[PDB]
From a paper:
A series of rigid connector modules replacing the DARPin capping repeats allow to combine the individual DARPin domains in such a way that their distance and angle can be altered to test different geometries, bringing the binding partners of the DARPins into a defined spatial arrangement. The two helices are not just joined end-to-end, but instead the two domains are made to overlap in such a way that the joining helix is stabilized by contacts with the domain cores along its entire length.
All 9 off7_Hxx_3G124 constructs were able to bind MBP and GFP simultaneously, demonstrating the absence of steric hindrance between the two targets, consistent with the structural models. Two DD constructs yielded crystals of the ternary complex: off7:MBP_H10_3G124:GFP crystallized in space group C2 (3.1 Å resolution, 3 complexes/ asymmetric unit (a.u.)) and off7:MBP_H11_3G124:GFP in space group P21212 (3.0 Å resolution). This is an important observation, as this reassures that any conclusions derived from complexes of DD and DDD fusions will also be valid for individual DARPins.
Author numbering:
A (entry chain A): 12 to 324
B (entry chain B): 5 to 372
C (entry chain C): 2 to 64, 68 to 230
Amino acid sequence: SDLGKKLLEAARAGQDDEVRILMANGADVNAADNTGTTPLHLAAYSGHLEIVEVLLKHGADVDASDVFGYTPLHLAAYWGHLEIVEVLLKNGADVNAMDSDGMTPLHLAAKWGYLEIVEVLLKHGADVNAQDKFGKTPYDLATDNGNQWIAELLKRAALRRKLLEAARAGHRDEVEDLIKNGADVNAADDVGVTPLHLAAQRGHLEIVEVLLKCGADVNAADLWGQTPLHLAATAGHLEIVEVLLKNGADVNARDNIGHTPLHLAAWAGHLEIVEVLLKHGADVNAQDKFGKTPFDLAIDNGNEDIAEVLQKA
Amino acid sequence: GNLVIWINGDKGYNGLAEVGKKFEKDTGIKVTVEHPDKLEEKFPQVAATGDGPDIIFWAHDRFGGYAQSGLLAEITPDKAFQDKLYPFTWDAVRYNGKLIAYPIAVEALSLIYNKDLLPNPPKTWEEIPALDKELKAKGKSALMFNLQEPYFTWPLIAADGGYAFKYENGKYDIKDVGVDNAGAKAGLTFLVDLIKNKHMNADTDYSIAEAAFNKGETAMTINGPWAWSNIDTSKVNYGVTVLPTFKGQPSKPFVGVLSAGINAASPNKELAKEFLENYLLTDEGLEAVNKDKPLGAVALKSYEEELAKDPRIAATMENAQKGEIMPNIPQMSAFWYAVRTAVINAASGRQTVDEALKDAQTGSGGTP
Amino acid sequence: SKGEELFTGVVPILVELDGDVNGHKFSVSGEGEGDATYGKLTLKFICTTGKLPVPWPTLVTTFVQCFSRYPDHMKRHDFFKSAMPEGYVQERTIFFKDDGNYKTRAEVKFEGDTLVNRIELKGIDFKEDGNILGHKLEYNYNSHNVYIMADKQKNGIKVNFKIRHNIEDGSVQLADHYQQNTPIGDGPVLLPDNHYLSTQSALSKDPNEKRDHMVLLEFVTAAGIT
């Protein structure tokens, strides 16, 4: 239609004021021309930030695919418009959308080497393992196009995400394999979680053993001060508690609240762990940020068989 | 004793008459220089078994049809004269291993760029995407050329190994077609990317490409020697250089060689052979017709080197030597239709590249 | 008693809030996971609109009491988990001592496998020299008792508690939380006898985060019945 063409033209031109008048007129936000291009596509490739904000407020299909399969995120990531990428993803943009050739927005950013864009794409869960039509991952495009650093960074981001998913699931053979291929055992996600954190919490004994021998920091602290020993106490994995303690796990390590692994073991109700913790020198007198001993937590939860052993002091 | 010659109006017929009138002064045989419309489609029927012009001027792509019927006389120049012209020019007039005509001028697309916006043009096709953002920063595009017709896009597709019909010793293998090989795919894929990447627009045609570069809106374009008169009217400080290289290979644009064929039913053929050989194909002879209407790049070297002073002409010659001759066989008519639909669909996303090319390979009577 | 079988293990948590305080429009997004078996919340919050006009601690309450640990003998009094997956509405009117007051509505419900807490907020009558707009609150949190009671009229629960917001000078700002929850589902919910919840919270900062954010570890348990 005519009004359709007006909005597409106004988007390419970047006339912020002209769009608002066009939106008040009820102009279809998802109107597409012959090529399937929408006003949101053009504003992204053009680089107009203010228009994208308004178009999304009016319910523009952020995952609209043109005849080639490109989406607004393809162009914004391709043309290096970081502000556009950041806002597009915030509004639910498909971070792993693929065009007719199987190329994700990460493939494009790796070709041109926009580091700052690749980081935000990875942070939002970009499939670095995604394969294009030509059997090339974004890491492959980073190397052929000469961006070797982003290739390394892409390689790293692949292994950590693969490694953490290997520990969480509980595949021993795979964890051993990835470390052979340069997987960083001390790799931590946005959450500060390491493969050891998940191997302990999830209860996979053999995986915990492997990671530790590869230099896994047993006292690794996530953003809440938690340690694999804290997680092993809450979950109640006795063998894991002993293993961590034998490899130098700080038995009086404190999370942000001040809980030791002893507080937590008394919280969930895992007696056998309380004994091992004390056997390895757990300060029974230690209090949390609110002055609560592991004893006070035991009586509050109504598991006095714990308090009885803590009454021993 | 008469000489009737035909030549299109847009070509230099006034200067040709000066050479013809000078020929009348030495042989006493009249030389009529006439420019009638529809001279190409009317020749094969009027003169097959009737009176027709003794000499004809037109692109070689048509002599393939005339030679199929045998309406043009076989010409045989001595080795001394064959060496005056560029070697590759005879291949345009070569049919079934035989020579049909005298090549006069050569035309082939060349890279035309705006020196003001871009003093140093790109030498490789891979440089445009990066350059496009740098120019798009100032509101101007890098490259813009006709995409509807395959004749304008072909040099990039054929750069890496694409070919219409294999040319071997003056004969095309009609069964073998080369619009499906990796070279055409590798090339066209890059073309589609530029459109997919918003570097160009699928709807781009001849007019807006000319208007865009003529108005200074874009910094580069691809066109033949015919658009020069319109650019200099636009007063754009334009230049001409070799087409950029893709995959290390040079772009292969189709070459059109304006040739001069002799009618089979002519009462004076030996004396007519002398006119073309000794009077038209000389510095003074070609200069006369060149003053009327320019011929661009010429087949005769001694006058090309004099025209090589102009880099715009010498540039066209550089592409011609690297480009591919346009086949004169009639099967090209199906080649254009089949290839035109491929670029249009792949450019508009209506069909994938591989699907578009394979449909064109068969459409041109080829086997994948 | 279905609805509680959903909290048996770790459940991801998404939190989106869009609020207004004295015209200082703002929006914030938090993510994480929570384990109701231990009343444990492992969350991180990020302000998407840039800077927060109000201090992070003031919104801790507003930012999923269903994860609160319920002893096996109080499962009859777990109004939150009994309302799932349908969810429950949460309305608060927080009174800041000698300052303005927030007024919140939020729908804590399951959207897919994850739990979400969509929140609306409006704060009014806050002094520019006040402890809120002045960012005079410390970046820390105390332990409190959340007293739950039943409201036979609304088919839901009523909750009232005061919260101590530490001040840098050493004083304290109190925030009277007058809360009212009602179920969204038109089915059976177990309205509990009067009891309370015990909360422990600690606030931290991600060193590798440039945006205005808040990291929060929270432990909650229910008590008051044998």
